[PDB]
Homo-oligomer: A and B are copies of this chain.
Amino acid sequence: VLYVGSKTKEGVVHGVATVAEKTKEQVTNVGGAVVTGVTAVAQKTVEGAGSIAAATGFVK
């Protein structure tokens, strides 16, 4: 796997620029997976998840 050159960007995240203004907000969770941010994950080789919430299990 000989490489030469000047660059090779594999799996990056490099620009995100964000602004949020939420005046009022409230969350009620029974069972439990709520993702309400920005979440800038990035990776190269994966065997099962990049990001997730996954909601697994009994709730009454």
Q: Is the CB of A32 within 8 A of B30?
A: yes
Given contacts A16-B18, A31-B59, A32-B29, contact A53 B54 (CB under 8 A): yes
SS of A interface (majority): loop
Q: Is the CB of A57 within 8 A of B60?
A: no
Interface size for A (C-beta < 8 A) is: 60
Contact of A6 (CB < 8 Å), options: B5, B29, B55, B56: B5
- Identify 19 residue pairs between A and B in the complex whose beta-carbon atoms are under 8 Å apart, listed by A's number: A1-B2, A1-B3, A2-B3, A4-B5, A5-B5, A5-B6, A21-B21, A25-B26, A32-B53, A33-B54, A34-B53, A39-B40, A39-B51, A40-B42, A41-B50, A43-B44, A50-B50, A54-B55, A58-B58
